[PDB]
Amino acid sequence: RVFHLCVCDPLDSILTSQIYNHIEQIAPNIHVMFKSSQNTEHQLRYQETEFVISYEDFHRPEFTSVPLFKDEMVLVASKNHPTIKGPLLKHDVYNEQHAAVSLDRFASFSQPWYDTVDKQASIAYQGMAMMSVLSVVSQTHLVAIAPRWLAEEFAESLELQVLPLPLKQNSRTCYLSWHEARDKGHQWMEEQLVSICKRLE
Amino acid sequence: RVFHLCVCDPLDSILTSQIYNHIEQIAPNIHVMFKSSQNTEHQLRYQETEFVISYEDFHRPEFTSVPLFKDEMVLVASKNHPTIKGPLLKHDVYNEQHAAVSLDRFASFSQPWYDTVDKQASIAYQGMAMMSVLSVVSQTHLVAIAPRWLAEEFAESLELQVLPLPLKQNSRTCYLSWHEARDKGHQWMEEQLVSICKRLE
């Protein structure tokens, strides 16, 4: 039995290792495959994907979304930054140079905070994934917006300072979603995923 | 003057910080913007992109490709792996579980080593970028194929062992490409990029 999960970036960098390590320990015929990339409805219904973990909530009755956890969104910068020695004021955020997840990406994590021409002009680097964004931030004077859990996990490794985000959209809730249609394996996997993620909390 | 570069993953994680840090020091009206994502011809000719850095070589006369450096491709695994305590034999490589860059990605770095159904079945995690792949490898028993320079840069931070790749396609050359058509700024930037990359060598 192979379970196909789509864990959207950057939630894959937060949750994948925890899910994989726990579900690998169970049995030799139980496996879990991960993607991080069609729309959710096409993925769930018409493709192997059985679960989606993302920041998007489905109130659509044919689908069921379960909230997993809420997290703060933070600004990150190198601990070696020449000028940033603490939190930025609201009016200075976009006077820095930013690294962000490519806005061309299908479900870009960064899109909510660069929804104007002015804000987008501050982006000097667009990477494919948040871990690419964090690695460039750790080697440059660029700043980025990331989930607090991810930033704190790699703060020591990549030498990052983790700062409050003085924007109003400073939190996000990630959800577990699936198509309500449902064998025993799928019901079982639902409860394991909910427990793994909430246990990490 | 703003220069638009497309540095294809994982070469952005190798080169972006070096290019940005050097070209930022120069002047306040000289800037460089990075993407890592149309085809190269559309990007170069018909879009803001002025240079492409990738593992692809253009012998097409209208375009000019300059080799920057050759690098070894290696296997990476967590230093905490329960069984991997050295290089893998050719016949054991694909008996491990792999993390790789999504094969759906336009120019997936990992595609050359997963070109069969058998090889692809060994992939348990598909991420959007090589830095996402390395971070999951550092937290799991999964293995991945990465450029040696990138693996060695983060070997200590992410606690990775860097192993020879017993495959025949174990090296790649990255090139600087552009559309031969060419102001003084573009000619200048060409020489800086060649010097920055070869200096890093």
Curated annotation (Swiss-Prot), chains A, B:
GO cellular component: protein-DNA complex
Disruption phenotype: Has no effect on leucine biosynthesis nor on bgl operon silencing.
Protein species of origin: Escherichia coli (strain K12)
Tagged with keyword tRNA processing: no
Record keywords, A-Z: Activator, DNA-binding, Repressor, Transcription, Transcription regulation
Chain's role: A global transcription factor. Activates transcription of the 9 following operons; yjjQ-bglJ, yjjP, acrEF, ybdO, yjcRQP, casABCDE12, rhsD-ybbC, fepE and gltF, in most cases it probably interferes with silencing by H-NS and activates transcription. Represses transcription of the 3 following operons; uxaCA, sdaCB and btsT. H-NS repression of the bgl operon, leading to the ability to metabolize some beta-glucosides. It also directly activates the bgl operon. Activation is H-NS and BglJ-RcsB independent.
GO biological-process terms attached to the record: regulation of DNA-templated transcription
Protein name: HTH-type transcriptional regulator LeuO
Signal peptide feature range: none
One GO molecular-function entry: DNA-binding transcription factor activity
Induction details: Gene expression is repressed by H-NS, activated by itself. More highly expressed in minimal than rich medium, poorly expressed in exoponential growth, levels increase in stationary phase (at protein level).
Family the UniProt entry places it in: Belongs to the LysR transcriptional regulatory family.
Gene name of this polypeptide: leuO
